[PDB]
Symmetry: D3
Subunit: 158 residues, 6 copies
């Protein structure tokens, strides 16, 4: 019954994202891991690559459905009949930004309830942004990524 | 799916009602659990707070109000809850919530903390603020359930 | 006597800005709503459009004067003989950024006193930035904008 | 244009003087209002705090020091104030200020809260910090008006 | 190079051990200084806290545990320390630390405050949190040195 | 014995940076003021200029060594045998960002200990970013810069 959506750019998907989506699947019947098709800034990985990586990294998770979407997240959520909006809150999260976002999304689709989940301490201080930047500059980020993502990232930067 | 929404609720305000209502639309059963919290010298006794919360949530079918004095995590496990509801206001209280969340996770890893956001209308209120205003005879009718406002007025009369 | 300046990019002006400038006109004799001519990033609306929209949205406000300015805000403030600097503080404001800004502006023009006003709860969680982005991506933002701004925004995005 | 600058001022520090001075350059009349705040067990009695503040602001012509024990908003309305002055330090206290501001706005919508920023010199001080240092005989001369420093030394002698 | 790591340490936790260990790898000698802090009504007496800290840091060769009741800055000067160690958790406590740091700098400008960051494992714990959990018989073995856990259990038995 | 590294873009070096590096030299034997060679966004001053300005501004400081570096800071730190990483924490610092950074750097090089120092109240509210922007827009920033930097900045903007 309960359909939740966990949207983001997932460029690329990290262990932190896997942590959050796993917790979400434990409390909700169906979870749609929604990948933004055209983010403001050109992503490192194409939508096709991001969807493929996300699908493989969540293949073990039954009620998780990876899908790409363009335009407004809220519009996609409504057409997908989602009533729960999953947001991951790391310890280094811009909380005020999350409040802005949740209130705008509530204005757009009040039937979509924002719920914030907390990752393990292990992934509470890292972001996809930092991971990409360290990787681009010759730093080891293997620890923060699913094996399939790690391999794809090495190919991408080579 | 059973969730527990713990707190001091001294007293339960419209903000708490907002959060628990959102919780009921998301989970099958919601246990509003009131901690004795003797160290906080609550204005209302646990018995009074439970009664107030019960009446204030009488219209919510899947809400159960209970009081407890033990470790919240043990009470949660004993109530068969797997979701722990917390409300996050327009304040940077987020820091304290993470400490509590991680401690509870250490005590009961299967109890998943979930944070809900209240409406803009109740984003700046707290039981403490309402009590302070009422102690100085200010009008707090707007922030409390009718039965709770009556109880607060009488308590300070 | 008391001349205040309420500067910004106002791209476009929103109900939150109207809320703040209205509160300012209630405590100060004359309020100059100053619109930055050339913001770092290309604005959605041209200075001409932004000034026109702001003028119409504040026409009902007597002691409000809409004016465009280039270069340093402090230099404009000084030449305009303003002694009060209005800053709106939303609940989702980057407070540390506001402190940086106020201290720099104080260094530049100590005779200009920064004063922070708080908008109603209704407009405390939205920014012009979020509004534009939601609008650009097919979301309903009518609620946050004066009617004239709403009409101009639809034309702009069409 | 009458403004009210409320607070516990226990004791009034150079930081408070900085804020009230900025207020006087902006508004015609400023009422520095000291709350009894019995629940905070102030170091100085309300009478002492008023006297200290009076002397400390004697040089400021448009400042009036008064004490009060009622609801701040009612006192403000009764003082004919339409501006409520609050100081914001280099701390994220901003959150608490919004709660207070919105409650006061609910109690008296025409009382407009305005936040002023102190100089860098006083951006990290508080009455609480000064008292803690003085309780351990540390030199706090730099942070307090001459009359206040004298009173604090004598109070702890 | 002598550093002082002051605190209430009521009780010293694995988080404190993490911070003091990082300090010893950076400076020649580290003085773990425990403040009497009577105003905080500590669970353990200063004597008990010193003993607990001593045992908990026995393996750290360049750490010296001492208690004090005077102004921290004077104690630091009297201990010949020129570095003041403070731990910063995953919380926005940073604000309070700046106030303390600037006051101590005013009292003793040559005492340089330095902030260290604990491991992720101890980034959300505090003495207060551990005591609260233990008061409700929750398992806090994971967060405390063996000797400290024993003392806490006995203290609450 | 103790070798510390104080990395940044220093574009340009300011009195706030001088404050922090001076405090660092007082507690550590040798301090390497490391200047990032190619920051994401094109710096105002070239690496050559930034190194020259930094060297002159710290010439009076004995145990300070100004050096440029490219790629990962952690990789440079390791090859330079640094065991202490100096970070300046202003009152207007994005603390959560600093935590993200310190944990990533710890992951990369655990033997490098992050230490945060606090500048004087005088430089606690200003950033290189704000200084450059005010200067670019005709504002007086002489107060925040060493004399040599001030002169170079005027030439740069002329
Ligand atoms: C689509 C969506 C779910 C994607 O989520 P996302 O990957 O987290 O995207 P974000 O842009 O927020 O990036 C995340 C991080 O970027 C940073 N960030 C992004 N915009 C920021 C801003 N304006 N200020 C500060 N930080 C910002 C933050 O650090 C943030 O993480 P945090 O809150 O935990 O600290 C989210 O953008 C959304 O719900 N957008 C609303 C409007 C919309 O529908 N998108 C446009 C349609 S194409
Ligand atoms: C001119 C001025 C009044 C315009 O105000 P403005 O529209 O609010 O412009 P800002 O760039 O601050 O944009 C506002 C929001 O952008 C964001 N922002 C801008 N720069 C940011 C930064 N460096 N870090 C984080 N957020 C930033 C913040 O979220 C901010 O809002 P908030 O503090 O409430 O959370 C202001 O820029 C100013 O006083 N500038 C000082 C220097 C100057 O004179 N301008 C240059 C002359 S051309
Ligand atoms: C190299 C390094 C030491 C330079 O330091 P730096 O000059 O301070 O660079 P930053 O990008 O952090 O710029 C500083 C300010 O920019 C702002 N900033 C930068 N990235 C930001 C982000 N993602 N979100 C918000 N603010 C950000 C912050 O305000 C910050 O200051 P603050 O924390 O006190 O408030 C630092 O970038 C580092 O340690 N990077 C890790 C990865 C690396 O090795 N660099 C890539 C190799 S080329
Ligand atoms: C009551 C509460 C949920 C805090 O909520 P509050 O801030 O709404 O009063 C918390 O103090 C609690 O869980 N108390 C029970 C005792 C306990 O288990 N404490 C450890 C919590 S980690
Ligand atoms: C005194 C003060 C302004 C707080 O200021 P303080 O932090 O400087 O002590 C506030 O506690 C107050 O207004 N007290 C009077 C009683 C009251 O009306 N309280 C409700 C405030 S919303
Ligand atoms: C003990 C401590 C370092 C605070 O640490 P804590 O938060 O770990 O208890 C501080 O309260 C202190 O320095 N106490 C001694 C008395 C004193 O000098 N106070 C003024 C500090 S500026």
């Amino acid at each position: 019954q309960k359909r939740a959506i966990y949207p983001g750019t997932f460029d690329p998907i990290t262990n932190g994202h896997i942590d959050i989506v796993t917790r979400a699947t434990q409390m909700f019947d169906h979870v749609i891991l929604a990948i933004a098709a055209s983010p403001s800034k050109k992503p490192m990985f194409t939508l096709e690559e991001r969807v493929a990586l996300a699908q493989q990294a969540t293949a073990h998770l039954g009620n998780v459905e990876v899908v790409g979407f363009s335009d407004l997240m809220a519009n996609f959520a409504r057409n997908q009949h989602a009533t729960v909006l999953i947001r991951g809150l790391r310890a280094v999260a811009d909380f005020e930004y999350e409040m802005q976002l949740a209130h705008m999304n509530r204005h757009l689709m009040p039937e979509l309830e924002s719920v914030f989940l907390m990752p393990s301490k292990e992934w509470s201080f890292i972001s996809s942004s930092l991971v990409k930047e360290v990787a681009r500059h010759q730093g080891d980020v293997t620890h923060f990524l699913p094996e399939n993502v790690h391999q794809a990232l090495m190919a991408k930067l080579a």
